[PDB]
Amino acid sequence: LHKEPATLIKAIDGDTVKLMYKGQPMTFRLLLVDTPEFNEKYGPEASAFKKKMEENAKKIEVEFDKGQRTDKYGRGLAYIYADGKMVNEALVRQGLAKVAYVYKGNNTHEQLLRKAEAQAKKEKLNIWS
């Protein structure tokens, strides 16, 4: 897998964001995670966390997996990094997302994220409290 550039256009919620990628605006959906919707418990805290991480970053990068790059809604499916730190992992590690939507052939970072979830759970953080 390789990291590619992108620039923040607009925060959306805990697991989607609008980025400019190869010079075109696209909504990206984070691979392998699920955050609570804004109206649900920890939804606003997830959105805030993601928003801050991405807006404060000097450099946003996208990393596609081996399989499908766009979902049925036209959303890019990627791992997103903010100054080299994986946003997908950070949300999970904070108890602000669950590992979810693990489809065969787009699951390179599954076990990394499952490890983060285990530690969040053990700490009783946020959704695991």
Ligand SMILES: Cc1cn([C@H]2C[C@H](OP(=O)(O)O)[C@@H](COP(=O)(O)O)O2)c(=O)[nH]c1=O
């Ligand atoms: C994260 C992800 C979601 N999706 C689809 C599955 C779900 O379909 P349905 O809309 O039919 O439930 C939906 C979940 O996204 P959200 O959690 O953004 O709603 O997006 C994928 O197809 N591939 C993926 O990797």
Ligand SMILES: [Ca+2]
């Ligand atoms: Ca969601």
